[PDB]
Each structure stands twice: as C-alpha cells, then as structure tokens.
Write a protein that binds this ligand. Structure first.
Ligand SMILES: C[C@@H](O[C@H]1OCCN(Cc2nc(=O)[nH][nH]2)[C@H]1c1ccc(F)cc1)c1cc(C(F)(F)F)cc(C(F)(F)F)c1
Ligand SMILES: CCCCCCCC/C=C\CCCCCCCC(=O)OC[C@H](O)CO
Ligand SMILES: CCCCCCCC/C=C\CCCCCCCC(=O)OC[C@H](O)CO
Ligand SMILES: CCCCCCCC/C=C\CCCCCCCC(=O)O
Ligand SMILES: CCCCCCCC/C=C\CCCCCCCC(=O)O
Ligand SMILES: CCCCCCCC/C=C\CCCCCCCC(=O)O
Ligand SMILES: CCCCCCCC/C=C\CCCCCCCC(=O)O
Ligand SMILES: CCCCCCCC/C=C\CCCCCCCC(=O)O
Ligand SMILES: CCCCCCCC/C=C\CCCCCCCC(=O)O
Ligand SMILES: CCCCCCCC/C=C\CCCCCCCC(=O)O
Ligand SMILES: CCCCCCCC/C=C\CCCCCCCC(=O)O
Ligand SMILES: CCCCCCCC/C=C\CCCCCCCC(=O)O
Ligand SMILES: CCCCCCCC/C=C\CCCCCCCC(=O)O
Ligand SMILES: CCCCCCCC/C=C\CCCCCCCC(=O)O
Ligand SMILES: CCCCCCCC/C=C\CCCCCCCC(=O)O
Ligand SMILES: CCCCCCCC/C=C\CCCCCCCC(=O)O
Length: 479
C-alpha cells in the first residue's frame, strides 16, 4: 500500500523537522541568554541535544529499513543505528532525573548544598560516558550480513546455547533507560508535588481586604459577641487530641497562667472537637473563667477568616505539623502565630514573624503567652505587617515552584507514555513469542517512541513564560 508508505514518511519527517527546530531553538534560548544559564536549564539543554541528535541521525534510516527490509547503508552506520539511540535516551532521561533530584533537594533539604554549574557540567560528562558505555555492546555486535542471500543489519552476540548474555543485556538496558529512572523521578516528584500542594493557600480568600473596619473594632465586636470585654485575645483551632494538635498543652498552659494577675488581661477562644476528656476539660475551664470561650460546633471558613482578622494571636501548639497551612492562614489575616517549632511551622515562622516554642512544654507556652501580652502593650502593626509579608512571599515561591514542577511532570509523563509500547513490543517475545500485521503495528509503535524527541520544546513553550518569550523572539519574522 504505497499511499500508506507516503503518509508514514510524512509523519516521520514531521517528527524530524519539529524535533530539530524546537530543540535547537531551546538550546539557543538557554545558552544565548545569561539569565537562562542555570543547573536545571543545563540538564535541559543536554536532553534537548540528545533528542535532536537522535531525531536527526536515526529517524530516516529507521523508517526506510522498517519499510524496506534490506540494509544498504554500510557497516559503520549499522553499528551507529544500533548504538546511538540507547546512549541518547539514556543521556536525556538521566538529565531529567538530575533535574528532578535538584528540585527535590532544593525543596526537601534546602540547607544541603546543591550542584554548582561546573559540577553540573561534570555530571553531564559522566552521564554521556555512562550512556556510551551502556550502548557499546549493542553497537559492537552489530554487523551487516547476507541472510542468506540479501544484506541485513543484525546484532550478533557470540554463540551461547541459551543467548543468556544478550537477553540479560536487553533487560538491563530497558530497566536503566525506562523503569528505574521513571520510578526514581516518580518518587521525587510525588514527594515534591504533595509537599508543595500541602503548603499552598488560596490568597483570593484568606485576605484581610475582605474584612471591614479597624482591627480594634472587629476584636471588640467579637469579644462582645462572646460576652467578654476587651483584652489581648488568643485563639486556638484544631482537633482535640493527645500527642498531635496540642490542645492538652494549651489547656495546661491556661491552668498555669490562671493563677497570675496577668491572666486578667487575656482572653482565650478555643475551637475544635475530639477526645471527650479534653472537651470536658475545656468546658470546665470555660465555666471556671470568664475570659475563656469554647466552640465545639463546626464553623464556616468565613467566620474563621473573621476570627483570624480580629484576634491578636493564634496559638498552634502542634506536636506534629508537617506543612503549617494554618500558620499561613493566620498570618495572612494579620494574626501573630505562637507555635511549636516543628515542621512547616518552623519553616514558615521566623523570629520577626511570630513566637516559637518547644512542642509539648506547657510552661514554655505560658511564657510565650506572657511575652505576647508584654508585646501587646506597644503597637503591633509592624509585627502583623511582617507576618503578612512573610506569608505572601512564601505563598509566592510555592506557586512558582508548583508551576515548574507541573511542567517537569508533564515532560516525564509524556516520556513514559511515548516509550511504554516500544519496550512492551520488544519484551513481549520473552513471555509470549507471537509476532505473526506486525509491520503496521511496528511503524506506529516506532513513530510514537521517536515522537518523544519533539514534545519537550512544545511543552516548555506552553508552560514556561521565559521559554515562551524565547520562542517568540526566535520566530519574530512570522506574524
Ligand atoms: C537500537 C534499537 O534497539 C532495538 O532494536 C534492536 C534490538 N534491541 C534489543 C536487543 N539488543 C541486543 O543486543 N539484542 N536484542 C532493541 C532494544 C534495545 C534497548 C532497549 F532498551 C529496548 C529495545 C533502538 C533502541 C531504542 C532505545 F533503547 F532507546 F529504547 C530506541 C530506538 C529508536 F527510537 F530509534 F527507534 C531503537
Ligand atoms: C521555521 C523554520 C522551518 C524550517 C523547515 C526545514 C528545517 C530543516 C532543518 C533540519 C531538518 C533536517 C536535519 C537533518 C536531517 C538528516 C537526514 C539524514 O539524511 O540523516 C543523516 C544520517 O547520518 C543518516 O541518514
Ligand atoms: C499527561 C499527564 C499530565 C499530568 C499533569 C499533572 C500536574 C500536576 O501534578 O501538578 C503538580 C502540582 O502542581 C505540584 O504540587
Ligand atoms: C501526514 C501527517 C500525518 C498523517 C499520518 C498518517 C499515518 C498513516 C497510517 C496508515 C494506517 O494507519 O494504516
Ligand atoms: C538545522 C536548523 C534548522 C533551523 C533551526 C532554527 C530555526 C529558527 O531559528 O527559527
Ligand atoms: C512540522 C511542520 C512544522 C514544524 C514547526 C517547527 C517546530 C516548532 C516547535 O517545535 O516549536
Ligand atoms: C545549538 C545552539 C548554538 C547556539 C549557542 C550559542 C551560545 C553563545 C553564548 O554562550 O553566548
Ligand atoms: C557530551 C557533551 C554534550 C554537551 C551538550 C550539552 C551540555 C550543555 C553544557 C552547557 C555548558 C555551558 C558552557 C558555558 O558556561 O558557556
Ligand atoms: C545507574 C545510573 C547511574 C546514573 C549516574 C548519574 C545519575 C544522575 C542523576 C542524579 C545525580 C544528581 C547529582
Ligand atoms: C555524542 C557522541 C556520539 C558518538 C557516537 C560514535 C559512533 C558510535 C558507533 C559505533 C560504536 C561501536 C564501536 C564498535 C567497534 C567494533 C570494532 C570491531 O568489532 O572490530
Ligand atoms: C509512571 C510514572 C511516571 C511519571 C509520574 C511521576 C510523577 C507523578 C507526580 C504526582 C505527584 C503529585 O503531584 O501529587
Ligand atoms: C515527616 C512528615 C510526614 C508527613 C506524612 C503525610 C502523609 C502523606 C505521606 C505519604 C502518602 C503518599 C501517597 C502518595 C500517593 C499519590 C498521591 C497523588 O497522586 O497525588
Ligand atoms: C501519573 C501521575 C500524573 C500526575 C498526578 C497528578 C495528581 C493530581 O493532579 O491530582
Ligand atoms: C498496558 C499497555 C498497553 C500498550 C499497548 C501497545 C503495545 C502493543 C504491542 O506491544 O504489540
Ligand atoms: C500521541 C501521544 C502523544 C503524547 C504527548 C501529547 C502531547 C503533549 C504536549 C503538550 C501538552 C501540554 C499540556 C499540559 C497541560 C497544560 C495545562 C495548562 O495549560 O494549564
Ligand atoms: C541557532 C538557532 C538560532 C535561533 C534564533 C535565531 C533568531 C535570533 C534573532 O534574530 O532574534
């Protein structure tokens, strides 16, 4: 069916041209602009070079040899045709693995040193050396030979009764360039994507701009709704439990403070439900003291935003706070956090943006509450401004990192999809020989696998403003 061959040749040429043009433009965008020269972009340039080289130097003969099963192209090209794609795919997928590892280090272990640019050039050279070494056996054993009357290019391992070495080599290459790097990148981006999503906040909602009036009028109206007169107002919200959210630590701190004269000047609002003994202890402290209020009913997020914008301080005595979104919610609304120095709370709150204490120590928490009462004698506006600025700038870095990580996840998923049918096609004989319309299926599977060399520049242009601007500059001639 010659018309099908014409359509297939057109599709393969579309692969070649799109891959070469887009990857060359990506290399120009990164290398020619000093702002673009980063660790991540260097690994991306290495991957773009590997993919453009494979599309430029293998696609045409792969198509022609798949369509016309006689080798006319010489011995050295037979070796290169069996050698280069393994090295190129290895170099590209491990450049992507290095990008994911650099992101995981910057986000999960910020204190630990990362690669310098020269270190990344060294890593890229090591990657290419390992790629060439892994590809070497397949190119070394390739030869042209009559089979028995017409020339073919074929991999000829030394004759062994079970061909065990060639089989183990193929399995190892498939693991090293597909399954293992995908598992590693999947772990890295799962941890990173969960940690970033758990640290995000909706700034369109948790925003002081939707409150009305001065903070003092709001706090007075709130205390009046609770039946209390004006005072320095502390708020807790969370589940009542032992060993987790710390409401028991806050209740012990309230009992410690209750004997002091300073307790007269404080007000407490404890919101949550859970362990009945803790609920009964909170109701006992509420009836015992006129400056304590407890709310076990569920509240709307609008009412909680009103509370965050009215109270003076929010107490977060968590034993365990991996992400600390509640601290961002309070700080965005101008409440000053008083929190255990654990996890995301320790990462977000600073000495200038809150008060931090050891988790599980009621006496240190009572001392921090007394320190907050001492701070309340003076104006707190600069403190709340620092809390708001810190919460905004933190949210901000999280959002940009989420964009970059989403782009890289789209890249890795496109790679996994494009290469799965190819490796399945070459692993099927080991579990079921079959292979008896195979040529039409092979042209489709090969087209999909090699199409992977053209998607990344398209992906960068859609999901990255800098690459989009670089593509606009490269194509300024066009409308
Ligand atoms: C060179 C060719 O390789 C296959 O065809 C020959 C036999 N070879 C298994 C074998 N090797 C022996 O020594 N005996 N049998 C196959 C194979 C090799 C390594 C694998 F991981 C999976 C399959 C290949 C490989 C890739 C890859 F490697 F990047 F995926 C991509 C492409 C291209 F995109 F251009 F079309 C072409
Ligand atoms: C917007 C601009 C649009 C421009 C549109 C045209 C772009 C053509 C450029 C590169 C494609 C060709 C790259 C090289 C392809 C080589 C084909 C080949 O013969 O491969 C040699 C290899 O050694 C064994 O075949
Ligand atoms: C094709 C598959 C597309 C998959 C797109 C996933 C996008 C994503 O997971 O986003 C990461 C998140 O923003 C980080 O916290
Ligand atoms: C021309 C560009 C794209 C068209 C791709 C046509 C692929 C032909 C496949 C024929 C078939 O499926 O039998
Ligand atoms: C071979 C190179 C083909 C052209 C690549 C650059 C395209 C461009 O600059 O717009
Ligand atoms: C196929 C014909 C169109 C090729 C366009 C060049 C590639 C542009 C790009 O990769 O962003
Ligand atoms: C292929 C991309 C070639 C263009 C790279 C130019 C880099 C120049 C520079 O480093 O300033
Ligand atoms: C084998 C080597 C393959 C090289 C291809 C891509 C690696 C890109 C490295 C970028 C080096 C930047 C040099 C510079 O600082 O100007
Ligand atoms: C078994 C494959 C070995 C690959 C070695 C290079 C891997 C590069 C990936 C992450 C390193 C980042 C520093
Ligand atoms: C980016 C760098 C790319 C370099 C590619 C170099 C070309 C590789 C092609 C074939 C290498 C395999 C060599 C096999 C030699 C066999 C000699 C013999 O059997 O006598
Ligand atoms: C098959 C695995 C290949 C790619 C998937 C890995 C990336 C998964 C990211 C999900 C994490 C998240 O955003 O919640
Ligand atoms: C040290 C702090 C530990 C915090 C643990 C928090 C609980 C979550 C931990 C592991 C669950 C991982 C499940 C990932 C499944 C994929 C989810 C997805 O696709 O988005
Ligand atoms: C396969 C994983 C693809 C990315 C997972 C995204 C998780 C999500 O968006 O909820
Ligand atoms: C499960 C994945 C299914 C992939 C189907 C494409 C492969 C077809 C084939 O190997 O013949
Ligand atoms: C034939 C199968 C090909 C598989 C790859 C498909 C092409 C993917 C390339 C670009 C698509 C990128 C879209 C990613 C989500 C964008 C979300 C958004 O724009 O907000
Ligand atoms: C080498 C490929 C260069 C791609 C960009 C060329 C256009 C730059 C310009 O004239 O603005």
């Amino acid at each position: 069916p010659a018309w099908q061959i014409v359509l297939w040749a057109a599709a393969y040429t579309v692969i070649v041209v799109t891959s070469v043009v887009g990857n060359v433009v990506v290399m120009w965008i990164i290398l020619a602009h000093k702002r673009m020269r980063t660790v991540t972009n260097y690994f991306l340039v290495n991957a773009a070079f590997a993919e453009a080289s494979m599309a430029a130097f293998n696609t045409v003969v792969n198509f022609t040899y798949a369509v016309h099963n006689e080798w006319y192209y010489g011995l050295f090209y037979c070796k290169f045709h069996n050698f280069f794609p393994i090295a190129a795919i290895f170099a590209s997928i491990y450049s992507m693995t290095a990008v994911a590892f650099d992101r995981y280090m910057a986000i999960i272990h910020p204190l630990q040193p990362r690669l310098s640019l020269t270190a990344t050039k060294v890593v890229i050279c090591v990657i290419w050396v390992l790629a060439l070494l892994l590809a070497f056996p397949q190119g070394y054993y390739s030869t042209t030979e009559t089979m028995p009357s017409r020339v073919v290019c074929k991999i000829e391992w030394p004759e062994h009764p079970n061909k065990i070495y060639e089989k183990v080599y193929h399995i190892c290459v498939t693991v090293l360039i597909y399954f293992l790097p995908l598992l590693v990148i999947g772990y890295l981006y799962t941890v990173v994507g969960i940690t970033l999503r758990a640290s995000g906040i909706d700034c369109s909602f948790w925003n002081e701009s939707y409150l009305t009036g001065s903070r003092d009028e709001r706090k007075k109206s709130l205390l009046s709704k609770f039946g209390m007169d004006e005072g320095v107002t502390f708020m807790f919200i969370g589940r009542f439990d032992r060993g987790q959210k710390g409401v028991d630590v806050l209740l012990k701190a309230i009992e410690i403070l209750s004997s002091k004269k300073e307790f007269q000047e404080m007000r407490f609002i404890i919101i949550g439900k859970g362990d009945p003994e803790l609920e009964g202890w909170a109701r006992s402290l509420e009836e015992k003291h006129g400056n304590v209020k407890v709310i076990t009913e569920m509240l709307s997020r609008e009412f909680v935003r009103e509370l965050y914008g009215s109270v003076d301080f929010v107490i977060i005595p968590s034993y365990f706070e991996p992400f600390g979104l509640v601290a961002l919610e309070a700080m965005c609304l101008g409440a000053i956090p008083i929190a255990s120095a654990v996890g995301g709370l320790r990462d977000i709150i600073t000495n200038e943006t809150g008060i931090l204490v050891k988790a599980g120590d009621p006496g240190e928490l009572a001392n921090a509450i007394l320190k907050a009462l001492e701070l309340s004698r003076s104006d707190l506006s600069k403190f709340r401004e620092n809390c708001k600025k810190r919460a905004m700038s933190f949210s901000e870095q999280v959002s940009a990192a989420r964009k970059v990580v989403k782009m890289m996840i789209v890249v890795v998923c496109t790679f996994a999809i494009c290469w799965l049918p190819f490796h399945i096609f070459f692993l099927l004989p080991y579990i079921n020989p079959d292979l008896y319309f195979i040529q039409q299926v092979y042209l489709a599977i090969m087209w999909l696998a090699m199409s992977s060399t053209m998607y990344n520049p398209i992906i960068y242009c859609c999901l990255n403003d800098r690459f989009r601007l670089g593509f606009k500059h490269a194509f300024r001639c066009c409308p």
